């Protein structure tokens, strides 16, 4: 247990010393409802009698 526990602190030093040195999609949303706001998009008529 203790020997494998020690080697764990050895792997936690590896990662620690290593990382200390180591090694667009536009058109939005509210703009796309305004760009598609060019309409021809509806229909209305009703209401007689």
């Amino acid at each position: 247990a203790e020997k494998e526990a020690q080697a764990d602190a050895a792997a936690e030093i590896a990662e620690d010393a290593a990382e200390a040195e180591d090694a667009x999609x536009x058109x939005x949303x509210x703009x796309x409802x305004x760009x598609x706001x060019x309409x021809x998009x509806x229909x209305x008529x009703x209401x007689x009698x």
Binding site: X46, X47, X48, X49
Partner: protein, 71 residues
């Protein structure tokens, strides 16, 4: 605890009937279509919706209840 009692008669819910309903319209011979069941004057109801025929009653269901119109 205790677990149950029940002097019987458990409650039911509702069926939304069946009703092949909209035959209620009429077409003379080729093709004039005369509506039946007068429609509703609420600007919320676009004259497609109709009224229900009871005693004293013509009733808009498109208004979930609203506005008793009586003829």
């Amino acid at each position: 605890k205790k677990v149950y009692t029940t002097p019987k008669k458990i409650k039911h819910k509702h069926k939304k009937v069946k009703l092949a309903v909209l035959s209620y319209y009429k077409v003379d011979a080729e093709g004039k279509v005369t509506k039946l069941r007068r429609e509703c004057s609420n600007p919320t109801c676009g004259a497609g919706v109709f009224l229900a025929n009871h005693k004293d009653r013509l009733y808009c269901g498109k208004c979930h209840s609203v506005y008793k119109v009586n003829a």
